[model samples]
Structure formats: C-alpha cells, structure tokens
Target: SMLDDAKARLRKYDIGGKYSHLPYNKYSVLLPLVAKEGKLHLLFTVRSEKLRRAPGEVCFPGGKRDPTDMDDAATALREAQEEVGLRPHQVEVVCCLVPCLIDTDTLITPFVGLIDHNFQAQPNPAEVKDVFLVPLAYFLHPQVHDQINHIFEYTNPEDGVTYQIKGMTANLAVLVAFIILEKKPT
Candidate 1:
C-alpha cells in the first residue's frame, strides 16, 4: 500500500541530524496527503499574488523561520496554523522530504503530515487566495510532465537528471525558482 510505505518512510526519516548550509533561514511545510475511501490526495495552496514574495503561486502552506519556533518542524506547524488554521495537534508529522534550495539561497524543508478527517480551510488574506487538492490517482497514468526545465551553473548545477512523475517533469532548481518568484497569480 502506498500509504503504508509513506508511513514507514516517515518513521525511518526521523533521525536527528545537522542541517545543510543555505543562505536564508529554513522554511518548512506540513504537507497533508489526504486519503479518503482508499484514495490519496495531495493538498496545496494558491497564493494571492499580492504579497511581497512568492505571490500568486501554488505551494504547500508554509513560510520562513520565526523566532518563537523550536526548529524547522515547528516553523512548518506554526505557519500551517497561521496560513490555514491547521492546529498542531491535528497533524501527524510523518517524515521530512529533502531540503530544497532556491535561487534566493533559502533552504526549504518539508514534512509529510496526515489528516484523518476532512476539514474546511481558511487561508490568510496576505498570502493565500485558494486551497486545492489533487488526487494521487491522477498521477497513476501516463501524462505529460510539462513542468520539467533546467538551470546550469559551473558547479552543482542540476542537469540531465529527469524527475518525471507521470509526465509532471520538474527540475529542483526551477521548482525552487517557481516558489521564489511565485509567478503571476491567476
């Protein structure tokens, strides 16, 4: 079962460790992949596009490090609470995805979380305009991964490596840029 694998992976990923050296303070996410009637869905937020940064882009609900937060995990939970009214108690932090670096040099850490029941979302006016869900089943078949593109640097530039999830082609750097740029919110 996919859910079982994800849960197992989450458990294994919880070991304590030092963090990578990146420019900005780390940002984190409580990424909720909801399952209903044996189907799984990924949650997302569409930003308002009016904010100073990352406006009008689709992203996991999260933000930069705050002084009061204990660590990157707390940062993720706190931002989730503020942005989508997600209570800390309601989420089970399964595991963290890799730390992604953007053009701005910020490091992003993502935590996989679980929600047992469906809840209504109220997004922050300053950052998010809408909340949406995409089912995992939608990715099971053949499709075009149009999002894949690349950026090159003399050192450590990601190239020739294709992370194509059922045609949802994406390069890590561009995804980072997309988050940093927040392109036009439509």
Candidate 2:
C-alpha cells in the first residue's frame, strides 16, 4: 500500500505528459532511486571538473534537451545514459514534477525514476566525475541538517502570471536527496 500511496501522491503533482513549447531554454533532470536491501537510495553525480560551469559540483544526471529528443522524459533518459551509462530500459520513470525555474532563466523539469540496485554505473569522465548513492534512511533521521526557509518568486511568461513560492532551503550538500525523497507532500 505504501507504493500505491506514493504513486497517488505523485499523481497529484504531475504536470501532465505534455509540456508547452516555450521560447526559453528548457532542461530535464532525472532523480534516480535504487532499491537496496528493501530500502531506497538516491543516486547522484559529481560533475566533471573539466566543465566550465559548476564543475565538480553535485547534481542529478541531466542536461538541456536536444532538438532530436522526443519529450522531457526522453531528455532525462538520454542524459542519464550519457552521464552514467544507464541503459534506457533500466529506468522506470515514475512521474514528472512541476517545472522549476533557475536563476539562469532556464526551466527545469524533474522526472523521478527507479533503477535496479545492481545497475552498472560508468560515469562519463567528461560530464560526470563520480557517482554516489545515499540511502533514503539517512535523511529520515532528524537533525541531519538545519532547515532554512526562503521565498522564491517567478512569473509564467505565457499567461503573464507570477507565483510567490515558499519552502525549506538547505545546503546544496543536503538538498539533492531532500528535494527528491524527503520533501514530497504526503
């Protein structure tokens, strides 16, 4: 029942299967989860140090979509395969979350995916410097990191609508797993 409950909650937040053709640059990221010993762990990547932007920083496997990509999910899968050597069949996409805007004026769509624990990972030296996994239980424990709250404001250019968002903010060190697993609404 827990899995179904999780699916139901995720369904509530789905942005639908299709996205609008926006004029601005768009990207997609995969939030990968692996089931290990009956528990879930979030997989992450350390960006290659050779990169000019945000080199050696922690991130989910993702990149901007190419014109050949079919959809946001396709973009996420292709990037995951390119960055971490994950075959497309190995990824079971659960759902797509609402798009989030970054300071660089890019819209990022996140797709939650499940992968096998035994999946082989070969980090692309050019894009991903390293691959790591953190158990979900690690954050289930309280007080791992102090939580900070912040307000983020953005406007939807299509309709001229603006939104003022409020949520917890933590260090980048803790935010990847927190946002992927711990921050979901029940």
Candidate 3:
C-alpha cells in the first residue's frame, strides 16, 4: 500500500495543473523509492566530477527539460535511464510533486516513483560516479539534515565517499519523507 499512500497525498501537485503558469524554466527528476530490508529506501546519485556543473554533488537522476518527451514524467524517466540505467518499466510512477524553484527562477519537478526492490543501478561512468540508498525513515527528523540551510550529507561505503546534498534535492527529501511518514516538520 506504500504506492497508494503516496499517490493519495501527492496527486494534487501533478503537472499540467496550477503550476503551468509559473514563469520559470523547468527541469524534472525522479525520486526513486525501493523496498529494502523491510524499509523504504530513497536512491541518490553522485555526479561525476568531470561534469561541467555541480560536479561531485548528489542529486536525483535528471537534468533540464525534455528533448521532446510526451510529458515531464517521460523526461524524468528518460533521464533516469540515461543517468543510472533505471528503465521506465521498472518504475511505477506515483506522482510529480509541486515544482521547486532553484537559482535564476528555475522550476525543477521531482517525480516520485516506486522502483523494483531488486533492481541494481548501473551508474554511467561518465555522468554518474556513484549511487546510494538511504532509508526514508532516517530523514524524518531535522537532525538528519539541516533544515535551516537545506543541506544533507550521507556517507556511503560503496565508494567510501561523502557528499553534501543541497538545493531542491534536499527539500524534496524532507517533503516526501514527511508526507509518506505522516510527519510534518517535527
């Protein structure tokens, strides 16, 4: 029922609604949720340091708007596959949350999707440096991330590295975890 629970609370923000009028460029990303060890884990990727922008930072798998995708969701699905090898078929998209504005008035939409639990991400060597999963429950409290600054950090053993999670990515982590866990800024 996890998917249903999320859809119920998140469907209101689906794209092509009120946010369509926002005067800002758009981007889309996927918030991948996978069941692991009886808990829901959120997937994140560390960008390749070789990238031109925001190198070596953590973000959901996506970049700017479409190369002519049918909708924002398709763009997100396509980006996921290109960045982390997550096929669209392996994801049961739940909802596209309200667009969060970042620098220079850019609206980035984070689409929530439930991924197959056993799917292993094949990080693209040139674009993605590493991928990690952190349980949603662990992010329920402010201690997990500095809400005032909207920053988060996770140490993953896969590559034995840590990265600061900032920007709209951190905000989405707080928002989704709160909604699904039924906790609001506590």
Measured by TM-score, the strongest candidate is 3
Which candidate order results from sorting by TM-score in descending order? 3, 2, 1
Report the Cα lDDT for candidate 1: 0.60
Candidate 3 Cα outliers beyond 4 Å, as residue runs:
12-16, 21-23, 142-150, 156-163, 183-186
Model 2 clash pairs are none
Q: What is the C-alpha lDDT of each candidate?
A: 0.60, 0.68, 0.79
> Tens digit of lDDT per residue, candidate 3, span 42-158?
899889999976888888998877558877788789889998899867998888787777678887777899998668999998999988887787677533556666677666556
Model 1 clash pairs are 49-56, 144-167, 145-167, 145-168, 145-169, 148-169
Let me know the TM-score candidate 3 reaches against the reference structure.
Answer: 0.84
Between 1 and 3, whose TM-score is larger? 3
On TM-score, who's better, 2 or 3? 3
For 37-80, candidate 2 gives per-residue lDDT tens digits of: 65566677778889875777667788898999998899999999
Best candidate per lDDT, number? 3
Clashing pairs in 3: none
Clash count, candidate 3: 0
